[PDB]
Design a protein around this ligand. Structure first.
Ligand code: ATP
Ligand code: ATP
Ligand code: MG
Ligand code: MG
Lengths: 167, 339, 399, 345, 284, 34, 174, 143
């Protein structure tokens, strides 16, 4: 590799620096425990949003709060087929965001996927395991997009050969 | 000495005078009191009166009184009568959720730092036989996360989300006596801002006073530990740590600090008085996922044996449901110069 | 539009696929998929071409109604659309059926399979009980045509008792009896093995099933039927002829007792299933009693049988007998115990049997998708694109 | 002295009888007569059942007290028609001949329990929401308002929204399950735009509930649209203005001097006001109304608008504690009690 | 399956069951079955005037005039014989089978009845293949609007026959997957030198149809089959027609197959991610 | 609506003589109390 | 529900909870001669083909216990009748089974020991033993007189099909 | 309605109001000194001069953008093999400021700017812990 491992290391370090969340009852709303990065009702509880960019197209925006961190990833999209495969995969996963407990239903503007890790998730899951899951996610999305592209190309080749062989 | 009480996180823990019973909040609206029956911990008491998550537990030893505050905007003073713990309600008059609660050294009052940018100093009024709260409001602008009383039952350290570490005066005339002059200041009315300090940024997760109280120390979310001397012209010394943010800090001696947090192991700091400077002394969980004993963030640290004047064993309670009893005596010979 | 909609009822045993506007489904295929990189996922078969093939492994995607393996479900519906129905999915609306107590997440997966893979212009995931009630309208020739009933949907999985009130299924009172077509087939197979020889071991599941297809009937009284078979043993014992797959020859077996012992386990589950022992009449009574009091009586007056396992002769009539007996006994016991001269109105239980009893759900779906309203109650692909899969969580009912 | 003071709250959920000055009720039991529930919206419909109920209360099994030699305090719902009040008074004086008889609206009892004389009580229960201003400890019937939205209507709306999610529920069979869902998960949103954004873009509001039949249902956004019917009646097809707008209007219809005092002591009561975030939402909406139709756009004087809407933690027994305070701190008076001699005048 | 069969199943099973019952001597059962096939074609298997002994299979095409202009009736009479009957109202071509007058072999009649749409389409193909064989160059191209938004152009030249499908992809994903499939089609002559030459033009009509009213759009692609005398000859005419008249549905079917496989891969990856995430819990 | 009417269309065939041509020898006889 | 006995009378003798119904026995035993043509053994032999499938029987009477005992012996009798060639051989097998001693109620190994009651005394024990043996002999005889088809050489399968079916999942062999 | 479109929370006298009273701001980092250092080949001196006087108190975004651009030009001007030594020439405050500038420069990728910024970030992390990244996240007055 040339710029994948350093990028993943930087993202992992920033996630460790950001996935330090504690339970925080709402200051503005009585008896509510809302993710502060979403409501943004108190500016003191919102951390500075940081960006780690592998190039001008692949980037992770990590914006943290006292009780929540939002991690948005822009997946690599070389060509149109990769673009549609990435978008279709992301909608596939985000439709079942109730199972991906740390996943958003809709991305932030300009980004492909968005994870929302609340203090509750770090309570019920190991934080370093969550960081490892996010990095593993970034790697496997690219791997599976490439696999889908290759599978579609091979499938189209076989379909064309099978149709044309019967003439 | 690691013991895994239960899988879900422990919000907060409090020991008793004999260090034989531990009251913990298992990320729930209940307080579980465990006691040592031989060599194993047996859950022997269950306290169920909070309508929401319990955020702070303290145990006054001499009165054996357990004060519990939670997100339900309530404080309860549990007293052991007969064989059961029964609660007395404490009106806090706070519209937001309470976060931290700490008893006074003389057990006459307790402080509840809450999310309404207030600290409720609550004391018993024998005339009407219900607890009464007085609010410290100015200049607290954000939520108070941590508290720690001065060893004179008057002053009060308060860490707040507004990046400011404060020392106020909680001199309630109806329950206290005249406070002696302290290097923090001489004029001590209730709610008086005795001292402030800060940094460029960072929420204050934990504050703790020294044995004599002339020294305060607070750990901020910006991976910094700060110590303020009242004697040395009210001066603050900042150490920007290279580790993850520290959540709970306690003095163990006059010149030593133990701070634990999201780095999942306690760390030791030394305050050189002559130079008035903090230095990293050495992590207390050097190994023989995470190699440290605590698999998740350590949320609370508290002196177990000897008190703040003769601390030889302390206790770290984490978000992994673990309680670790660290003996600094053994760690003295374990590492090179872990003094 | 102009092209008729596609109605596919994907049951656990038999998938019933066809086009709207038709009385009976054009295909009743087994709900089985035979499967072995590249295009190998298209090298599979469904229906009768998948029961037994040399080099293929057969798998049943649907177990107890709930779809287990969704990939196999997608491939199955793929050849349903393109090999059997021969429909362009972009021009035909689809009326899919859902099992009782189906999770909205499963509705979302079905909608995603239909839309993001086949690009259908519309989809309507209909509850099976309401379709059965719709099919029941062909036998009730009065103005008592309401969607309030107690559907006894019995197939090859579990026999569901489903109370529908005002068109909406009361999901808190649905009760499943683990006796269905497969249990009856197993019982008849065991009876045949213990009585007659000459049954090939590899055909015993089929030669029994055909028996259960053609010679079975519920019995008014077990000992009376046994005495009839013993004494008048010429008009009751039938002869079944079959052809052995290996060494093709004709074999004749005496179809006797199992004729009335096939569906009897609907009425005495302790005969075959040891864990479950209460008759279907008691289950229906308990289901309806669990329902609100204001709707209890309508659920008696409209008990609709759907599925092949309910197509046994006199099954509905005997069910009416048993349910009326238990209801009248309960009423008499209550009157005797209370002694307050309440005198409740006598309860009339009416099990609606109809000529479309077998494919009741598909018939209801066809007559539902043959209407102008279906187009204005479907979920258009445009709605899928704007709102999302959530639109397919609720499919509105009709009058 | 006199003593022998008994206070008996007659709430629809439970009847609670005890003695004056008690921090907690001595006896609590559901208002069950057998199985009938004549208590609908706090107005009696079957008086014989209530006669049996009071006989049970004063019977040896519950209190074992002499009615002719005891002082009784009863709780009256707001907007109680005068016929019911008079008939209850006649029942106390004739069928029980109590020496000390007094009845008052639940609003003043609430304020006495919390320790206030002036303020507005928002008592929302299962039948109807009542907004009752009280000045100098005397309820003001003129300014009291009723909003026909309560726990039952919110439960029905939640059932409708759960059907919209594809959950086979019924309005007559699964009422109690949805009621428990509303108690355990529903809350009042603060900014409905922001809450809707959080529901439609994030899965943090999704919570799993185990129905009695074992099926797990994931209740997400509907946690906050169900109570929103209190603020937006049109969501349940009810003509109105909403609880916050109604409260602001009923305060603004009062004397100019008392408006500031009413603002600072608006107290919530009843089960339907236990929703998280309800006081914050009421404060925000009242501030918005003050900005719109009192300040008329400017924000300079909004900071002077002091509003303190506190839901008391001891909500469960507010009426009983108010009765105990009223019948303990001032029981020894003479002109206060309505006695049988005055009845027989 | 890969190749889309050219036989309508519903007709095949219905007529096979009816003929088996008639041969067995059983009383025929009334049939009233309306259904549809690809290209928006409507079938109706019924009984004329209620007589059970006669079974009528009617086919309705929204474009039967454009085929009738190229000898549709002549082909249908030659292939179906006396079974051709005056069409039912609302339908274009009707076949009548008398259940009392079946021939000895029912397989041929059932299979021909299955090929009803194929023989409706094959008239223009027969005409233009004969045009190529006879050397009648310059004859006007045949335009067939087999669906509302998709079109077809058949042209005969000196040494080749051009068959252009004007297809419309509903979604952008359809468009890109079709681009991939057609790119594989274009270079498919490497593995088979005797195959027809497939050309693809996305968003732009070829120069041949530029003078015509061929639609232009981002979702519209044109697929040109160049068929040589080795494919337009009598021996291979049937197979060539069978494949060419279903190529469009074949391509769309395989696009949807690719989407289904892509969903399978996403489901596998989602399951792997969910297992990884549930392993992160302290208790698993 | 149209659903009720289209379902009823079958009533001419459904509203006819008995399904069984004669119940030929193999079904439980009627005349049971049922 | 499972079919029930119908020949119970208030004057019918009771040995424990066991019921001493009369039979038409040609043999000699404690059971008295019955004028009626219907007996508990015959009623069992009739109802058995439908009772054997029932794995849950409610003992609503005391003649019911007689019914279950005769049904279990019928099950054992068909188990031992599968390997036979003639009516005479079958009857000899029935006599051999009857002359043996299956467990009496109370003794270990007897099915439904929690439903039946132990004999009170030695005289009652002997009466119960003789009654059970007589019922066994009559059951075997009336079984063989009808199991074999009216034409010779046919132990008809219509009763052989029940060989492996145990009433209430219990058998007299264990 | 129409009264729900007003955000009362903004007009409340309880929000955390940052002081923002640093003032000063003497043109931030010096352009001439760093230009002279870069031209003379004193790359380490160029980095040291670039990290002096951060615009931690300047409210205007133009000076912050100028300082970020200067620091970015210095950072890409470096060679990879010589980066590590440079990182070791800064104290805790210097490394924290360098990581703030690195995280600022990631937001504007150009050619191989991100490729060398990732090496800079790795070395800065190695020499200054994860607490430096934490301070980058937490600093309200950040470059
Ligand atoms: N007389 C009969 N009529 C119809 N089916 C019968 C009959 N006797 C036995 N069966 C069998 O009963 C079963 C009924 O299967 P059915 O298609 O109704 O199930 P399903 O697909 O699970 O149904 P559903 O669509 O209601 O969920 C088949 O196995 C069929 O062979
Ligand atoms: N914690 C809670 N959160 C939300 N709603 C609750 C809660 N507890 C109770 N409720 C609801 O509040 C209502 C109970 O009303 P309450 O107990 O005050 O009765 P009430 O005022 O005596 O009634 P009524 O109007 O019939 O006289 C119910 O609708 C119940 O679902
Ligand atoms: Mg089924
Ligand atoms: Mg109330």
């Amino acid at each position: 590799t040339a710029t994948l491992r350093p990028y993943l290391s930087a993202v992992r370090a920033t996630l460790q620096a950001a996935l330090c969340l504690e339970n925080f009852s709402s200051q503005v709303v009585e008896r509510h425990n809302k993710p502060e990065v979403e409501v943004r009702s108190s500016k003191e509880l919102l951390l500075q949003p940081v960006t780690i960019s592998r190039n001008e197209k692949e980037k992770v925006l990590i914006e943290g709060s006292i009780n929540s961190v939002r991690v948005s990833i822009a997946v690599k999209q070389a060509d149109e087929i990769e673009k549609i495969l990435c978008h279709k995969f992301m909608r596939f996963m985000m439709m079942r965001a109730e199972n991906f407990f740390i996943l958003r239903r809709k991305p932030v503007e300009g980004y492909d996927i968005s994870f929302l890790i609340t203090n509750f998730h770090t309570e019920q899951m190991y934080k370093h395991k969550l960081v490892d899951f996010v990095i593993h996610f970034m790697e496997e999305i690219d791997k599976e997009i490439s696999e889908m592209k290759l599978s579609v190309n091979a499938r189209a080749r076989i379909v064309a050969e099978e149709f044309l062989k019967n003439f | 000495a690691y013991h895994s009480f239960l899988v879900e996180p422990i919000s907060c823990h409090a020991w008793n005078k004999d260090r034989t019973q531990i009251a913990i909040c298992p990320n729930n609206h209940e307080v579980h009191i465990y006691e040592k029956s031989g060599n194993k911990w047996v859950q022997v008491h269950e306290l169920k009166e909070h309508n929401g998550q319990v955020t702070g537990i303290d145990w006054a030893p001499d009165s054996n009184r357990i004060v519990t505050c939670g997100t339900d905007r309530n404080a309860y003073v549990w007293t052991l009568k007969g064989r059961t713990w029964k609660p007395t309600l404490v009106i806090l008059r706070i519209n937001r959720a309470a976060r931290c609660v700490r008893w006074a050294p003389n057990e006459k009052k307790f402080a509840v730092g809450s999310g309404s940018r207030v600290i409720s100093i609550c004391y018993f009024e024998q005339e009407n036989d219900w607890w009464v709260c007085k609010h410290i409001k100015k200049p607290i602008r954000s939520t108070v996360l941590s508290l720690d009383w001065h060893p004179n039952s008057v002053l009060l350290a308060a860490g707040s989300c507004d990046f400011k570490c404060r020392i106020f005066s909680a001199y309630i005339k109806e329950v206290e006596e005249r406070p002696a002059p302290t290097p923090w200041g001489s004029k001590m009315p209730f709610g008086e801002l005795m001292f402030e300090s800060s940094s460029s940024c960072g929420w204050v997760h934990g504050v703790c006073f020294s044995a004599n109280g002339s020294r305060v120390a607070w750990v901020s979310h910006d991976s910094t530990v700060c110590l303020a001397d009242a004697d040395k012209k009210m001066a603050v010394a900042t150490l920007a740590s290279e580790t993850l943010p520290l959540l709970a800090v306690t003095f163990i001696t006059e010149s030593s600090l133990v701070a634990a947090g999201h780095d999942c192991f306690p760390v030791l700091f030394t305050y050189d008085s002559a130079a008035g400077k903090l230095s990293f002394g050495g992590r207390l969980d050097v190994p023989k996922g995470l190699d440290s004993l605590h698999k998740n963030s350590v949320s609370q640290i508290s002196v177990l044996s000897g008190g703040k004047a003769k601390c030889s064993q302390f206790c770290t309670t984490g978000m992994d449901g673990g309680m670790s009893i660290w003996d600094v005596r053994s760690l003295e010979s374990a590492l090179k110069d872990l003094k | 539009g102009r092209l008729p909609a596609c109605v596919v009822d994907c049951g656990t045993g038999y998938t019933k696929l066809g086009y709207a506007g038709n009385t009976e489904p054009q295909f009743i295929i087994p709900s089985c998929i035979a499967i072995k990189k590249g295009v190998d996922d298209l090298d599979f078969f469904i229906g009768d071409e998948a029961i037994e093939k040399p080099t293929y492994a057969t798998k049943w995607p649907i177990r107890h109604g709930i779809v287990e393996d969704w990939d196999l479900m997608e491939r199955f519906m793929e050849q349903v659309i393109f090999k059997y129905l021969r429909a362009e999915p972009e021009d035909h609306y689809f009326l899919l059926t859902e099992p009782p107590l189906n999770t909205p997440e499963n509705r979302e997966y079905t909608a995603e399979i239909m839309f993001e893979s086949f690009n259908v212009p519309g989809l309507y995931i209909a509850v099976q009980a309401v379709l059965a009630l719709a099919a029941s309208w062909t036998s009730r020739q009065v103005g008592e045509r309401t969607l309030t009933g107690t559907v006894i949907d019995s197939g090859d999985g579990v026999t569901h008792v489903i109370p529908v009130a005002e068109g909406y299924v009361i999901g808190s009172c649905i009760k499943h009896i683990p006796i269905a077509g497969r249990d009856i087939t197993y019982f008849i197979q065991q009876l045949l093995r213990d009585r007659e020889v000459g049954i090939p071991p590899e055909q015993s599941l089929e030669t029994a099933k055909a028996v259960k297809e053609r010679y079975s009937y519920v019995c008014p009284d077990l000992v009376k039927e046994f005495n009839k078979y013993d004494t008048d043993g010429s008009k009751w014992i039938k002869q079944y002829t079959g052809i052995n797959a290996i060494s093709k020859k004709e074999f004749s077996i005496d179809v006797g007792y199992e004729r009335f012992l096939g569906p009897e386990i609907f009425f005495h589950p302790e005969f075959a299933n040891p864990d479950f022992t209460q008759p279907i009449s008691e289950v229906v009574d308990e289901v309806i009693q669990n329902c609100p009091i204001d709707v209890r009586r309508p659920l008696y007056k409209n008990i609709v049988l759907s599925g092949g396992s309910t197509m046994f002769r006199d099954f509905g009539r005997r069910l009416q007998r048993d349910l009326k007996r238990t209801v009248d006994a309960r009423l008499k016991l209550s009157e005797e115990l209370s002694g307050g001269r309440l005198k409740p109105k006598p309860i009339d239980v009416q099990v609606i049997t109809h000529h479309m009893q077998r494919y009741a759900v598909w018939f209801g779906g066809s007559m539902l998708a043959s209407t102008p309203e279906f187009y204005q109650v479907c979920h258009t692909k445009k709605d899928y694109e704007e709102i999302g899969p959530s639109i397919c969580r609720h499919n509105p009912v009709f009058g | 002295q006199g003593r022998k003071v008994v206070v008996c709250d007659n709430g629809t959920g439970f009847v609670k009888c005890g003695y004056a000055g008690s921090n907690f009720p001595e006896h609590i039991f559901p208002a069950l007569v057998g199985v009938n529930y004549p208590m609908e919206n706090g107005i009696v419909r079957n008086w014989d059942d209530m006669k049996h109920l009071w006989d049970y209360t004063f019977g040896p099994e519950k209190l074992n007290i002499d009615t002719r030699n005891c002082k009784i305090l009863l709780t009256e719902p707001p907007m109680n028609p005068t016929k019911n009040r008079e008939k209850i008074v006649e029942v106390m004086f004739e069928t029980y001949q109590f020496s000390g008889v007094y009845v008052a609206i639940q609003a003043v009892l609430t304020l006495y329990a919390q320790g206030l004389l002036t303020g507005v009580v928002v008592d929302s229960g299962d039948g109807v929401t009542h907004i009752c201003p009280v000045y100098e400890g005397f309820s003001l019937p003129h300014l009291t308002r009723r909003l026909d939205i309560a726990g039952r209507d919110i439960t029905r709306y939640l059932i409708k929204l759960l059907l919209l999610r594809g959950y086979a529920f019924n309005h007559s069979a699964d009422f109690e399950t949805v009621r428990m869902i509303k108690e355990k998960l529903c809350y009042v949103g603060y900014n409905i735009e922001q809450e809707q954004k959080l529901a439609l873009e994030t899965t943090v509001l999704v919570e799993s509930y185990t129905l009695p039949d074992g099926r797990i249902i994931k209740v997400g956004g509907e946690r906050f649209e169900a109570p929103e019917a209190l603020f937006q009646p049109h969501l349940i097809n009810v003509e109105g203005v909403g609880v916050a707008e109604l409260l602001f209007n009923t305060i603004q219809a009062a004397d100019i001097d008392t408006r500031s005092e009413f603002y600072k002591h608006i107290v919530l009561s009843g089960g339907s006001t236990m929703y998280p975030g309800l006081p914050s939402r009421l404060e925000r909406e009242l501030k918005q109304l003050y900005l719109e139709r009192v300040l008329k756009g400017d924000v300079e004087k909004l900071s002077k608008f002091k509003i303190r809407i506190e839901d008391p933690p001891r909500r469960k027994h507010m009426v009983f504690l108010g009765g105990a305070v009223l019948a303990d701190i001032m029981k020894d008076k003479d002109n206060f009690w309505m006695t049988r001699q005055e009845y027989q005048e | 399956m890969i190749l889309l069969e050219v036989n309508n199943r519903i007709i095949e099973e219905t007529l096979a069951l009816k003929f088996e019952n008639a041969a067995a001597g059983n009383k025929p059962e009334a049939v009233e079955v309306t259904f549809a096939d690809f290209d928006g074609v409507l079938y109706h298997i019924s009984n004329p005037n209620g007589d059970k002994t006669k079974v009528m299979v009617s086919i309705s095409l929204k474009f039967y005039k454009e085929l009738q202009a190229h000898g549709a009736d002549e082909l249908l009479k030659r292939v179906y014989g006396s079974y051709l009957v005056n069409p039912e109202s609302g339908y274009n071509v009707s076949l009548l089978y008398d259940l009392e007058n079946l021939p000895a072999s029912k397989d041929s009649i059932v299979h021909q009845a299955g090929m009803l749409k194929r023989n409706c389409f094959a008239s223009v193909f027969e005409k233009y293949f004969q045009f190529q064989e006879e050397g009648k160059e310059g004859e006007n191209r045949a335009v067939i609007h087999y669906r509302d938004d998709e079109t077809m152009y058949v042209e005969s030249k000196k040494d080749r026959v051009t068959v252009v499908f004007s297809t419309v992809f509903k979604d952008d994903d359809d468009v890109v997957i079709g681009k991939v499939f057609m790119q594989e089609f274009k270079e498919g002559r490497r593995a088979s030198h005797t195959a027809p030459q497939v050309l693809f033009s996305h968003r732009e009509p070829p120069l041949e149809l530029k003078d015509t009213d061929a639609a232009v759009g981002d979702n519209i692609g044109y697929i040109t089959f160049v068929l040589f005398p080795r494919h337009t000859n009598a021996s291979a005419r049937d197979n060539t027609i069978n494949l060419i008249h279903t190529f469009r549905d074949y391509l769309h079917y395989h696009i949807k197959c690719s989407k289904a496989y892509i969903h399978t891969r996403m489901r596998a990856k989602t399951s792997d991610f969910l297992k990884v995430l549930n392993r992160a819990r302290p208790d698993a | 609506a149209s659903w009720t009417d289209n379902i009823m269309a079958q009533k001419c065939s459904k509203g006819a003589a008995a399904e069984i041509r004669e119940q030929g020898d193999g079904a439980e006889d009627e005349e049971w109390d049922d | 529900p499972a079919y029930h006995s119908s020949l119970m009378d208030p004057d019918t003798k009771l040995i424990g909870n066991m019921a001493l119904l009369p039979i038409r026995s040609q043999f000699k035993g404690p059971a008295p001669r019955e004028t009626k043509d219907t007996d508990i053994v015959d009623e069992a032999i009739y109802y058995f083909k439908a009772n054997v499938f029932f794995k849950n029987y409610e003992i609503k009477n005391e003649a019911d216990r007689t019914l279950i005992y005769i049904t279990l012996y019928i099950s054992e009798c068909l188990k031992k009748l599968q390997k036979c060639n003639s009516k005479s051989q079958g009857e000899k097998e029935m006599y051999t089974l009857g002359i043996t001693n299956f467990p009496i109620p109370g003794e270990p190994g007897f099915p439904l020991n929690a439903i039946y009651a132990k004999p009170a005394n030695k005289q009652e024990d002997e009466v119960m033993r003789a009654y059970l043996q007589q019922l066994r002999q009559e059951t075997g005889l009336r079984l063989c007189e009808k199991v074999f088809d009216p034409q010779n050489d046919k132990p008809s399968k219509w009763w052989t099909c029940f060989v492996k079916r145990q009433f209430m999942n219990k058998s007299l062999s264990g | 309605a129409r009264f729900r479109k007003v955000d009362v929370d903004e007009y409340d006298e309880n929000k955390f109001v940052d002081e923002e009273d640093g003032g000063d701001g003497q043109a931030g980092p010096d352009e001439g000194e760093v230009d002279s250092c870069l031209r003379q080949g004193n790359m380490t001196a160029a980095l040291q001069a670039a990290l002096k006087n951060p615009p931690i108190n300047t409210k205007s975004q133009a000076v912050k953008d100028r300082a970020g651009s200067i620091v970015l030009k210095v950072l890409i001007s470096f060679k990879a093999n010589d980066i590590e030594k440079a990182v070791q020439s800064l104290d805790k405050n210097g490394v924290d400021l360098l990581m703030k500038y690195i995280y600022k420069g990631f937001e504007s990728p150009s050619d191989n700017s991100s490729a060398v910024l990732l090496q800079w970030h790795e070395k800065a992390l190695a020499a200054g812990g994860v607490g430096s990244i934490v301070r980058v996240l937490t600093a309200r007055k950040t470059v």
